[PDB]
Amino acid sequence: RGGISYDQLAKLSYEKTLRNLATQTQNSSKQDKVQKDTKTGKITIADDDKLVNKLAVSLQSESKKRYEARKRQMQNAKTLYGVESFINDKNKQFNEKLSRES
């Protein structure tokens, strides 16, 4: 049991997004360079604007999905426990935090 370290958590997050990129290519397949300017020193990479848009969309979708999966957790945990005496929400979140200690 126990917790998962950050180097093991990062690999599992990297393994998970590779399966999201695998099925994204499978759902697409189901439906149907390097230039180095010598004067400036800058390196320009030419890439597809669709794959850059799909990168920007999927990060926003994962940002909203974790935002909504946490918002429902806020609305559920506020309306679970009311037995022990509280005063405000920061007291409830602290007295619940004492319960996970024991």
Binding site: Y14, T17, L18
Partner: protein, 268 residues
């Protein structure tokens, strides 16, 4: 850095990134994701170059046996035994460095042999057990893992030859630990009288009758007596019968030269 360039299908930038990242020797999570990257890209010649470097960065059998799990997944027989030949030579070449344990080298010898058993060459499966036990006489795990290979793939006289040795070492280590367990002596002698007959066979019978006082003890000497007697015998018989006998010496003189040795042993 990787999963963004994965998302852009820039396969030459993640490859350049991984070459740098595996140059700084980071750990086994990076390499295992780098061999999983080339499987995606089907670069079979490139992923074979990684395991050439991956065993040099993490010298240990779970990196070598991962590389033979790669090759036996693809069934290329010419490439797999080349990796197997490189893995077992490097243990021999780098014996003095002491970086592979006795349990660790037993996984290489067994996975080499059980692959050669599936490749129908039992004479290469059998001979490597002899070179490994001689090359390493210290590790008992490679000797004991030799036996399970004979149990599965060997002919019956060869198993009985090797079985007789492991029973010899295990009977020897209990009797050195436990002092007077007379029922294990009566098998350990009969281990050597049955299958070990030789100078050792006589010698243990000395070493047993060394260990021999109980009612539980003395009949073991009776066994060694006849074991000697079946094949001196009077001379050892007088030495043991000295435990005490005035009636015995009077019984001895009347029926030693008169009647036999069997009569002489009857007094004892």
């Amino acid at each position: 850095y990787l999963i963004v360039e994965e998302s852009l299908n820039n396969v030459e930038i993640v490859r350049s990134l991984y070459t740098k990242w595996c140059s700084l020797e980071p750990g086994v999570n990076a390499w295992n994701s780098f061999v999983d990257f080339e499987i995606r890209q089907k670069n079979w010649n490139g992923v074979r170059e990684i395991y050439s470097k991956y065993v040099m960065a993490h010298p240990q059998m779970q990196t070598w046996l991962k590389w033979v799990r790669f090759e036996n997944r693809h069934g290329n027989t010419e490439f797999t035994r080349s990796v197997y030949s490189l893995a077992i030579d490097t243990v021999a070449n780098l014996q003095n460095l002491q970086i592979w344990s006795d349990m660790e080298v037993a996984k290489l010898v067994n996975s080499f042999a059980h692959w050669e058993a599936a490749q129908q060459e039992y004479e290469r499966s059998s001979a490597l057990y002899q070179i490994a036990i001689e090359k390493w006489p210290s590790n008992q795990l490679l000797k004991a893992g030799l036996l399970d290979f004979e149990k599965q793939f060997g002919d019956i006289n060869s198993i009985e030859e090797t079985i007789s040795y492991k029973r010899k070492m295990e009977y020897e280590t209990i009797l050195s630990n436990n002092a007077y367990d007379y029922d294990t002596w009566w098998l350990y002698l009969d281990l050597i009288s049955e299958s070990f007959p030789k100078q050792i066979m006589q010698t243990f019978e000395k070493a047993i009758v060394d260990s021999r006082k109980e009612l539980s003890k003395n009949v073991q000497w009776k066994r060694y007596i006849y074991l000697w007697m079946r094949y001196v015998e009077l001379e050892l018989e007088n030495s043991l019968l000295e435990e005490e006998f005035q009636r015995l010496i009077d019984d001895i003189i009347p029926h030693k030269h008169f009647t036999k040795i069997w009569l002489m042993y009857a007094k004892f």
